[PDB]
Amino acid sequence: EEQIVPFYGKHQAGITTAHQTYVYFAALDVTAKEKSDIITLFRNWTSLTQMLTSGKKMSAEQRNQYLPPQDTGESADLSPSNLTVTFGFGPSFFEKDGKDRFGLKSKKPKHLAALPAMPNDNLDEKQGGGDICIQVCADDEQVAFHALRNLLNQAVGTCEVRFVNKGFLSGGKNGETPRNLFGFKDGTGNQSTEDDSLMNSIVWVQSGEPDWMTGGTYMAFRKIKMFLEIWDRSSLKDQEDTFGRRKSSGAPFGQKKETDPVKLNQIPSNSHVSLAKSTGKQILRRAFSYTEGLDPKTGYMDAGLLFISFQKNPDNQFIPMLKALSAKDALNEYTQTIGSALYACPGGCKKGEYIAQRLLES
Amino acid sequence: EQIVPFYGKHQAGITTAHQTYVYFAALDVTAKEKSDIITLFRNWTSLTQMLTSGKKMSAEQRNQYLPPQDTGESADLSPSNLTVTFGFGPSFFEKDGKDRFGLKSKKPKHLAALPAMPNDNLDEKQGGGDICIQVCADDEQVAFHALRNLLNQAVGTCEVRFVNKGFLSGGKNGETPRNLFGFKDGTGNQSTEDDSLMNSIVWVQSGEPDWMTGGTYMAFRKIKMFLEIWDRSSLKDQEDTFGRRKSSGAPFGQKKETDPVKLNQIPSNSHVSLAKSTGKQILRRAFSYTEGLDPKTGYMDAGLLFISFQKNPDNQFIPMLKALSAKDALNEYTQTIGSALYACPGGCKKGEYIAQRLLES
Ligand code: HEM
Ligand code: HEM
Ligand SMILES: [Cl-]
């Protein structure tokens, strides 16, 4: 065994866990009618995820060769590649069209609502929302896709799949901050995910939420198109100015080191770093780049960021950033948000329990 | 050092060990003069050399008012066995009966659109193209970085026709990589380290324009794979479709993946049976793709970027295509939605540029 990340724990993996290279990110709508159908679904997803992340090798026997294989096979020879699978629920899981579909509204999390419309949104409704999100990460795309596929396979009959995105973010060979598609290092401003205390104040829900959220968090999702062709033709100055860091070093303007503190009065008031840091709030950003062939509409490379961030309180920590950035981020010149969602992520699973058990009345 | 020589007798990325990631693009030349194309090929040479060598694109950082020459996302990354391969389609040589660039006298012997086959549902905008670029690396970000910087240099000269990307992970202990059907992919290929076998299967050695010497032809097919129909099929149906066992990858009746196929032991209509029975060899070097939900099926949109190399597509590849399109069991679970044939020049010598002998220095 080698690249394994415990599935069971105080929290779900794939949040504070070291950033893997690949993500597959899916949203589902529950079409089933009874909570018991959903319990079944969550039960099976638990077994299978445990199996997948542990590197438990599925086969060996597979009796009755007239039956479908229970596993799709393409990961048979592959390392678990730090596979994590994270689950969350959107507003619509709890209340859809003013109806409480599953008797769950009394256990609705404190901060779970659609994100407010923002300026420069060009949201595709079908590229956001959804009853359930599944975030699958691994250091190997094939491993990640294998997981999503086997998980989605189990949801046939109960859910319809709403969207499946995938992305990548390679870190440096020597552990440097991974660079996004704008050539800039991404994640410098995050607090240390290995600092349990900082993660408890930023990410982890500890109280003031339904019990099933304890050791959970909220996940904000934004699919943000990045106009590479316009960016690439911009001067280095314009690029650096857009962010308030230098491209190479990743250092804040005026500072020498990437990890030096940002000096606010040294970067434009309209820079991405400036706007986000002001407001004074912290989130845990854990984004991945995407490319999706040619945009049929522009004829250019369809590319962007799968912005994913975790926060114990999206209203206090994330939305104010979103408000500030959408107003006058210099970055707005080179990006546009085309998908949006907010998910509530349950606390971790204890061995012998299933995901979100405490939410569907065990 | 995860570097693969760019310069050599052949272009890299053909017999070179299969990397995990590919970006596969086609371009149309919109420029009018050969000299524009020479410039394009000259620049692509410098940049490819630079990129594949792991030369870290630096030296200075001045004139902050200019766009940076390099996009930067690969700054911290190993070259990850980056290879970049170039080829040309029929349309490079002749468009509308006219010879666009004075190149028809050096047209390769076998370069034509593949014939339409039964079951084809070709999207014309998912195939053809004047120039293909195949970018492979063990790291998607490195591969995308290369394509992007290469395409960036083509602005003004070409328009991009399509960009595909795919993956195919080999086992932790070097097993044959499995495609999205869970089956090992490439067992039947001869050894790419057997120079003689590669000379008879892949490499052009004579009877072609001189710029093709140590070149090859690249057949491309974008083949959708219906994962949801496959997944619901019995193991028997799956194994029967191919004529090998899923796990071992061994031919029916044999114990080992590399044991010889015994034809009278696998269905008449199995993929392996029909392909082998043509008596012909190709070099398959495919990658899986996923592209989100198909808006039409509502399922995963997934398949194979089938890429194969052969010295003579008319003798080696087309007869396979004929046989398989007729009655391959696999036709139940796949459908070809893009097609192209490209002629790949011989390798570049240091101080020369790609396809120079065709464009005449
Ligand atoms: C929901 C939208 C986004 C939010 C809420 C957001 C938020 C943030 C935050 C909080 C920081 C750290 C600032 C600090 O406290 O020091 C940051 C930095 C940064 N963001 Fe974003 N961001 C968003 C979208 C994007 C996009 C589309 C890009 C494009 C690549 C991007 C690139 C960067 C870069 C390069 C930095 C450098 C600072 C760092 O990561 O340490 N962000 N962003
Ligand atoms: C129509 C395009 C294709 C052609 C021309 C083609 C050709 C071939 C050839 C020549 C072989 C070697 C057989 C032998 O001599 O032992 C082979 C084997 C195989 N093909 Fe294909 N193939 C095609 C499409 C596909 C697709 C879409 C898949 C998967 C979806 C696939 C999966 C396989 C597998 C699993 C094997 C056996 C393992 C191996 O020896 O490579 N093929 N194919
Ligand atoms: Cl699917």
PDB file of N, CA and C in Angstrom, chain A residues 23-94:
ATOM      1  N   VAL A  23      -9.221  16.473 -10.744  1.00  0.00           N
ATOM      2  CA  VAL A  23     -10.522  16.429 -10.101  1.00  0.00           C
ATOM      3  C   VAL A  23     -11.541  16.032 -11.157  1.00  0.00           C
ATOM      4  N   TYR A  24     -12.541  15.267 -10.739  1.00  0.00           N
ATOM      5  CA  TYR A  24     -13.801  15.184 -11.440  1.00  0.00           C
ATOM      6  C   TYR A  24     -14.868  15.671 -10.470  1.00  0.00           C
ATOM      7  N   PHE A  25     -15.744  16.540 -10.961  1.00  0.00           N
ATOM      8  CA  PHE A  25     -16.699  17.244 -10.121  1.00  0.00           C
ATOM      9  C   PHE A  25     -18.072  17.103 -10.778  1.00  0.00           C
ATOM     10  N   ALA A  26     -18.969  16.380 -10.095  1.00  0.00           N
ATOM     11  CA  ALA A  26     -20.279  16.078 -10.650  1.00  0.00           C
ATOM     12  C   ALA A  26     -21.357  16.635  -9.727  1.00  0.00           C
ATOM     13  N   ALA A  27     -22.506  16.985 -10.310  1.00  0.00           N
ATOM     14  CA  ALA A  27     -23.681  17.257  -9.508  1.00  0.00           C
ATOM     15  C   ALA A  27     -24.809  16.330  -9.938  1.00  0.00           C
ATOM     16  N   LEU A  28     -25.621  15.895  -8.957  1.00  0.00           N
ATOM     17  CA  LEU A  28     -26.744  15.009  -9.216  1.00  0.00           C
ATOM     18  C   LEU A  28     -28.036  15.644  -8.713  1.00  0.00           C
ATOM     19  N   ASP A  29     -29.156  15.280  -9.331  1.00  0.00           N
ATOM     20  CA  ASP A  29     -30.486  15.562  -8.808  1.00  0.00           C
ATOM     21  C   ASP A  29     -31.128  14.249  -8.373  1.00  0.00           C
ATOM     22  N   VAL A  30     -31.685  14.223  -7.162  1.00  0.00           N
ATOM     23  CA  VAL A  30     -32.386  13.040  -6.687  1.00  0.00           C
ATOM     24  C   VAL A  30     -33.754  13.046  -7.361  1.00  0.00           C
ATOM     25  N   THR A  31     -34.109  11.953  -8.045  1.00  0.00           N
ATOM     26  CA  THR A  31     -35.409  11.843  -8.694  1.00  0.00           C
ATOM     27  C   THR A  31     -36.287  10.856  -7.928  1.00  0.00           C
ATOM     28  N   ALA A  32     -35.661  10.057  -7.056  1.00  0.00           N
ATOM     29  CA  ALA A  32     -36.373   9.170  -6.154  1.00  0.00           C
ATOM     30  C   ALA A  32     -37.324   9.966  -5.267  1.00  0.00           C
ATOM     31  N   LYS A  33     -38.279   9.237  -4.671  1.00  0.00           N
ATOM     32  CA  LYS A  33     -39.386   9.827  -3.945  1.00  0.00           C
ATOM     33  C   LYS A  33     -39.224   9.629  -2.438  1.00  0.00           C
ATOM     34  N   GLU A  34     -38.713   8.470  -1.995  1.00  0.00           N
ATOM     35  CA  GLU A  34     -38.584   8.194  -0.569  1.00  0.00           C
ATOM     36  C   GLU A  34     -37.154   8.381  -0.074  1.00  0.00           C
ATOM     37  N   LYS A  35     -37.051   8.893   1.158  1.00  0.00           N
ATOM     38  CA  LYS A  35     -35.802   9.013   1.889  1.00  0.00           C
ATOM     39  C   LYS A  35     -35.066   7.668   1.910  1.00  0.00           C
ATOM     40  N   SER A  36     -35.807   6.562   2.012  1.00  0.00           N
ATOM     41  CA  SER A  36     -35.181   5.250   2.110  1.00  0.00           C
ATOM     42  C   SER A  36     -34.376   4.928   0.849  1.00  0.00           C
ATOM     43  N   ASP A  37     -34.830   5.423  -0.306  1.00  0.00           N
ATOM     44  CA  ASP A  37     -34.072   5.258  -1.541  1.00  0.00           C
ATOM     45  C   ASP A  37     -32.731   5.980  -1.432  1.00  0.00           C
ATOM     46  N   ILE A  38     -32.758   7.156  -0.803  1.00  0.00           N
ATOM     47  CA  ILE A  38     -31.572   7.974  -0.660  1.00  0.00           C
ATOM     48  C   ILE A  38     -30.627   7.320   0.347  1.00  0.00           C
ATOM     49  N   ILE A  39     -31.190   6.777   1.448  1.00  0.00           N
ATOM     50  CA  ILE A  39     -30.386   6.053   2.427  1.00  0.00           C
ATOM     51  C   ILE A  39     -29.643   4.920   1.723  1.00  0.00           C
ATOM     52  N   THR A  40     -30.361   4.135   0.902  1.00  0.00           N
ATOM     53  CA  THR A  40     -29.737   3.062   0.134  1.00  0.00           C
ATOM     54  C   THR A  40     -28.557   3.626  -0.667  1.00  0.00           C
ATOM     55  N   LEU A  41     -28.819   4.726  -1.389  1.00  0.00           N
ATOM     56  CA  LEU A  41     -27.822   5.334  -2.241  1.00  0.00           C
ATOM     57  C   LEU A  41     -26.584   5.709  -1.417  1.00  0.00           C
ATOM     58  N   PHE A  42     -26.805   6.435  -0.305  1.00  0.00           N
ATOM     59  CA  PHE A  42     -25.706   6.857   0.552  1.00  0.00           C
ATOM     60  C   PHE A  42     -24.967   5.671   1.185  1.00  0.00           C
ATOM     61  N   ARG A  43     -25.704   4.604   1.523  1.00  0.00           N
ATOM     62  CA  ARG A  43     -25.090   3.399   2.053  1.00  0.00           C
ATOM     63  C   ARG A  43     -24.119   2.796   1.035  1.00  0.00           C
ATOM     64  N   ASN A  44     -24.593   2.563  -0.191  1.00  0.00           N
ATOM     65  CA  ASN A  44     -23.748   1.977  -1.219  1.00  0.00           C
ATOM     66  C   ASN A  44     -22.546   2.876  -1.546  1.00  0.00           C
ATOM     67  N   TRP A  45     -22.776   4.195  -1.642  1.00  0.00           N
ATOM     68  CA  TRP A  45     -21.695   5.108  -1.947  1.00  0.00           C
ATOM     69  C   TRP A  45     -20.607   4.998  -0.892  1.00  0.00           C
ATOM     70  N   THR A  46     -21.010   4.829   0.355  1.00  0.00           N
ATOM     71  CA  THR A  46     -20.062   4.618   1.441  1.00  0.00           C
ATOM     72  C   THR A  46     -19.229   3.347   1.217  1.00  0.00           C
ATOM     73  N   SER A  47     -19.864   2.175   1.061  1.00  0.00           N
ATOM     74  CA  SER A  47     -19.077   0.964   0.833  1.00  0.00           C
ATOM     75  C   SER A  47     -18.061   1.199  -0.279  1.00  0.00           C
ATOM     76  N   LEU A  48     -18.580   1.578  -1.459  1.00  0.00           N
ATOM     77  CA  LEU A  48     -17.793   1.713  -2.671  1.00  0.00           C
ATOM     78  C   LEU A  48     -16.682   2.754  -2.488  1.00  0.00           C
ATOM     79  N   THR A  49     -16.962   3.879  -1.831  1.00  0.00           N
ATOM     80  CA  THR A  49     -15.907   4.867  -1.678  1.00  0.00           C
ATOM     81  C   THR A  49     -14.777   4.316  -0.813  1.00  0.00           C
ATOM     82  N   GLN A  50     -15.155   3.779   0.348  1.00  0.00           N
ATOM     83  CA  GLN A  50     -14.221   3.097   1.221  1.00  0.00           C
ATOM     84  C   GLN A  50     -13.350   2.151   0.391  1.00  0.00           C
ATOM     85  N   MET A  51     -13.984   1.292  -0.407  1.00  0.00           N
ATOM     86  CA  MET A  51     -13.307   0.287  -1.205  1.00  0.00           C
ATOM     87  C   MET A  51     -12.299   0.966  -2.137  1.00  0.00           C
ATOM     88  N   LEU A  52     -12.765   1.956  -2.903  1.00  0.00           N
ATOM     89  CA  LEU A  52     -11.992   2.692  -3.900  1.00  0.00           C
ATOM     90  C   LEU A  52     -10.807   3.449  -3.294  1.00  0.00           C
ATOM     91  N   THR A  53     -11.030   4.172  -2.198  1.00  0.00           N
ATOM     92  CA  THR A  53      -9.964   5.008  -1.669  1.00  0.00           C
ATOM     93  C   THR A  53      -8.909   4.160  -0.957  1.00  0.00           C
ATOM     94  N   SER A  54      -9.270   2.953  -0.513  1.00  0.00           N
ATOM     95  CA  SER A  54      -8.374   2.129   0.301  1.00  0.00           C
ATOM     96  C   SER A  54      -7.378   1.394  -0.590  1.00  0.00           C
ATOM     97  N   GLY A  55      -7.720   1.302  -1.865  1.00  0.00           N
ATOM     98  CA  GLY A  55      -6.932   0.551  -2.814  1.00  0.00           C
ATOM     99  C   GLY A  55      -7.262  -0.937  -2.737  1.00  0.00           C
ATOM    100  N   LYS A  56      -8.351  -1.290  -2.038  1.00  0.00           N
ATOM    101  CA  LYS A  56      -8.895  -2.641  -2.068  1.00  0.00           C
ATOM    102  C   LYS A  56      -9.161  -3.014  -3.521  1.00  0.00           C
ATOM    103  N   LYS A  57      -8.531  -4.108  -3.962  1.00  0.00           N
ATOM    104  CA  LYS A  57      -8.567  -4.472  -5.366  1.00  0.00           C
ATOM    105  C   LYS A  57      -9.788  -5.365  -5.574  1.00  0.00           C
ATOM    106  N   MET A  58     -10.749  -4.856  -6.356  1.00  0.00           N
ATOM    107  CA  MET A  58     -12.113  -5.346  -6.473  1.00  0.00           C
ATOM    108  C   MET A  58     -12.233  -6.854  -6.731  1.00  0.00           C
ATOM    109  N   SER A  59     -11.464  -7.389  -7.696  1.00  0.00           N
ATOM    110  CA  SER A  59     -11.812  -8.653  -8.336  1.00  0.00           C
ATOM    111  C   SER A  59     -11.262  -9.859  -7.576  1.00  0.00           C
ATOM    112  N   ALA A  60     -10.747 -10.848  -8.329  1.00  0.00           N
ATOM    113  CA  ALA A  60     -10.186 -12.104  -7.842  1.00  0.00           C
ATOM    114  C   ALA A  60     -11.076 -13.294  -8.216  1.00  0.00           C
ATOM    115  N   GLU A  61     -12.380 -13.114  -8.033  1.00  0.00           N
ATOM    116  CA  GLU A  61     -13.360 -14.186  -8.332  1.00  0.00           C
ATOM    117  C   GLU A  61     -14.283 -13.737  -9.464  1.00  0.00           C
ATOM    118  N   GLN A  62     -15.176 -12.784  -9.164  1.00  0.00           N
ATOM    119  CA  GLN A  62     -16.266 -12.349 -10.033  1.00  0.00           C
ATOM    120  C   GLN A  62     -16.991 -13.561 -10.633  1.00  0.00           C
ATOM    121  N   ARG A  63     -17.810 -14.232  -9.814  1.00  0.00           N
ATOM    122  CA  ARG A  63     -18.512 -15.440 -10.229  1.00  0.00           C
ATOM    123  C   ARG A  63     -19.516 -15.084 -11.323  1.00  0.00           C
ATOM    124  N   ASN A  64     -20.067 -16.120 -11.986  1.00  0.00           N
ATOM    125  CA  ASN A  64     -21.199 -15.981 -12.889  1.00  0.00           C
ATOM    126  C   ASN A  64     -20.846 -14.997 -14.010  1.00  0.00           C
ATOM    127  N   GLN A  65     -20.122 -15.493 -15.020  1.00  0.00           N
ATOM    128  CA  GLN A  65     -19.620 -14.620 -16.066  1.00  0.00           C
ATOM    129  C   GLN A  65     -20.730 -14.110 -16.993  1.00  0.00           C
ATOM    130  N   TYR A  66     -21.991 -14.411 -16.658  1.00  0.00           N
ATOM    131  CA  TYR A  66     -23.141 -13.962 -17.425  1.00  0.00           C
ATOM    132  C   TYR A  66     -23.696 -12.683 -16.811  1.00  0.00           C
ATOM    133  N   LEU A  67     -23.126 -12.280 -15.669  1.00  0.00           N
ATOM    134  CA  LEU A  67     -23.544 -11.026 -15.063  1.00  0.00           C
ATOM    135  C   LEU A  67     -22.600  -9.900 -15.486  1.00  0.00           C
ATOM    136  N   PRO A  68     -23.065  -8.636 -15.424  1.00  0.00           N
ATOM    137  CA  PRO A  68     -22.226  -7.471 -15.636  1.00  0.00           C
ATOM    138  C   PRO A  68     -21.145  -7.553 -14.575  1.00  0.00           C
ATOM    139  N   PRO A  69     -19.888  -7.155 -14.878  1.00  0.00           N
ATOM    140  CA  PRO A  69     -18.870  -7.009 -13.836  1.00  0.00           C
ATOM    141  C   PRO A  69     -19.340  -5.888 -12.907  1.00  0.00           C
ATOM    142  N   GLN A  70     -19.100  -6.015 -11.593  1.00  0.00           N
ATOM    143  CA  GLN A  70     -19.544  -5.039 -10.598  1.00  0.00           C
ATOM    144  C   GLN A  70     -18.648  -3.798 -10.578  1.00  0.00           C
ATOM    145  N   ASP A  71     -17.432  -3.926 -11.125  1.00  0.00           N
ATOM    146  CA  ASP A  71     -16.475  -2.834 -11.241  1.00  0.00           C
ATOM    147  C   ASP A  71     -16.136  -2.687 -12.716  1.00  0.00           C
ATOM    148  N   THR A  72     -15.894  -1.456 -13.190  1.00  0.00           N
ATOM    149  CA  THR A  72     -15.693  -1.237 -14.618  1.00  0.00           C
ATOM    150  C   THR A  72     -14.285  -1.610 -15.095  1.00  0.00           C
ATOM    151  N   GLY A  73     -13.327  -1.781 -14.170  1.00  0.00           N
ATOM    152  CA  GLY A  73     -12.062  -2.413 -14.525  1.00  0.00           C
ATOM    153  C   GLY A  73     -10.874  -1.490 -14.802  1.00  0.00           C
ATOM    154  N   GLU A  74     -11.086  -0.264 -15.253  1.00  0.00           N
ATOM    155  CA  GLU A  74      -9.961   0.452 -15.839  1.00  0.00           C
ATOM    156  C   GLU A  74      -8.940   0.870 -14.786  1.00  0.00           C
ATOM    157  N   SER A  75      -9.240   0.678 -13.497  1.00  0.00           N
ATOM    158  CA  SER A  75      -8.256   1.049 -12.488  1.00  0.00           C
ATOM    159  C   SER A  75      -7.545  -0.169 -11.878  1.00  0.00           C
ATOM    160  N   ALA A  76      -7.821  -1.370 -12.396  1.00  0.00           N
ATOM    161  CA  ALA A  76      -7.346  -2.618 -11.813  1.00  0.00           C
ATOM    162  C   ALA A  76      -5.849  -2.592 -11.463  1.00  0.00           C
ATOM    163  N   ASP A  77      -5.035  -1.983 -12.327  1.00  0.00           N
ATOM    164  CA  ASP A  77      -3.594  -2.127 -12.211  1.00  0.00           C
ATOM    165  C   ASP A  77      -3.005  -0.849 -11.626  1.00  0.00           C
ATOM    166  N   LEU A  78      -3.854   0.086 -11.179  1.00  0.00           N
ATOM    167  CA  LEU A  78      -3.404   1.431 -10.845  1.00  0.00           C
ATOM    168  C   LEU A  78      -3.324   1.633  -9.336  1.00  0.00           C
ATOM    169  N   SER A  79      -2.384   2.497  -8.910  1.00  0.00           N
ATOM    170  CA  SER A  79      -2.234   2.856  -7.503  1.00  0.00           C
ATOM    171  C   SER A  79      -3.433   3.698  -7.076  1.00  0.00           C
ATOM    172  N   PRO A  80      -3.861   3.732  -5.795  1.00  0.00           N
ATOM    173  CA  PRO A  80      -5.011   4.565  -5.430  1.00  0.00           C
ATOM    174  C   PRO A  80      -4.812   6.065  -5.616  1.00  0.00           C
ATOM    175  N   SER A  81      -3.571   6.505  -5.813  1.00  0.00           N
ATOM    176  CA  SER A  81      -3.264   7.853  -6.285  1.00  0.00           C
ATOM    177  C   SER A  81      -3.874   8.943  -5.407  1.00  0.00           C
ATOM    178  N   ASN A  82      -4.003   8.685  -4.104  1.00  0.00           N
ATOM    179  CA  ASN A  82      -4.524   9.613  -3.104  1.00  0.00           C
ATOM    180  C   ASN A  82      -5.970   9.976  -3.396  1.00  0.00           C
ATOM    181  N   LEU A  83      -6.720   9.033  -3.994  1.00  0.00           N
ATOM    182  CA  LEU A  83      -8.136   9.212  -4.291  1.00  0.00           C
ATOM    183  C   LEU A  83      -8.907   9.698  -3.067  1.00  0.00           C
ATOM    184  N   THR A  84      -9.572  10.845  -3.223  1.00  0.00           N
ATOM    185  CA  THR A  84     -10.557  11.248  -2.244  1.00  0.00           C
ATOM    186  C   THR A  84     -11.878  11.462  -2.962  1.00  0.00           C
ATOM    187  N   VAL A  85     -12.958  11.243  -2.230  1.00  0.00           N
ATOM    188  CA  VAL A  85     -14.288  11.501  -2.729  1.00  0.00           C
ATOM    189  C   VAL A  85     -14.983  12.308  -1.643  1.00  0.00           C
ATOM    190  N   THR A  86     -15.540  13.464  -1.981  1.00  0.00           N
ATOM    191  CA  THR A  86     -16.180  14.336  -1.009  1.00  0.00           C
ATOM    192  C   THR A  86     -17.641  14.530  -1.417  1.00  0.00           C
ATOM    193  N   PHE A  87     -18.564  14.503  -0.455  1.00  0.00           N
ATOM    194  CA  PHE A  87     -19.958  14.684  -0.821  1.00  0.00           C
ATOM    195  C   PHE A  87     -20.501  15.966  -0.217  1.00  0.00           C
ATOM    196  N   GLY A  88     -21.397  16.639  -0.947  1.00  0.00           N
ATOM    197  CA  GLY A  88     -22.107  17.772  -0.375  1.00  0.00           C
ATOM    198  C   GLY A  88     -23.551  17.822  -0.868  1.00  0.00           C
ATOM    199  N   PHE A  89     -24.373  18.677  -0.251  1.00  0.00           N
ATOM    200  CA  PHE A  89     -25.803  18.803  -0.636  1.00  0.00           C
ATOM    201  C   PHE A  89     -26.155  20.277  -0.869  1.00  0.00           C
ATOM    202  N   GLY A  90     -26.952  20.539  -1.910  1.00  0.00           N
ATOM    203  CA  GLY A  90     -27.385  21.874  -2.251  1.00  0.00           C
ATOM    204  C   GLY A  90     -28.729  22.174  -1.615  1.00  0.00           C
ATOM    205  N   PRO A  91     -29.153  23.449  -1.642  1.00  0.00           N
ATOM    206  CA  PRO A  91     -30.458  23.833  -1.099  1.00  0.00           C
ATOM    207  C   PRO A  91     -31.556  22.894  -1.592  1.00  0.00           C
ATOM    208  N   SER A  92     -31.489  22.522  -2.880  1.00  0.00           N
ATOM    209  CA  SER A  92     -32.599  21.824  -3.511  1.00  0.00           C
ATOM    210  C   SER A  92     -32.799  20.412  -2.945  1.00  0.00           C
ATOM    211  N   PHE A  93     -31.767  19.854  -2.302  1.00  0.00           N
ATOM    212  CA  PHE A  93     -31.906  18.579  -1.621  1.00  0.00           C
ATOM    213  C   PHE A  93     -32.933  18.687  -0.498  1.00  0.00           C
ATOM    214  N   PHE A  94     -32.978  19.862   0.154  1.00  0.00           N
ATOM    215  CA  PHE A  94     -33.759  20.050   1.369  1.00  0.00           C
ATOM    216  C   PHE A  94     -35.157  20.554   1.041  1.00  0.00           C
TER     217      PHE A  94
END
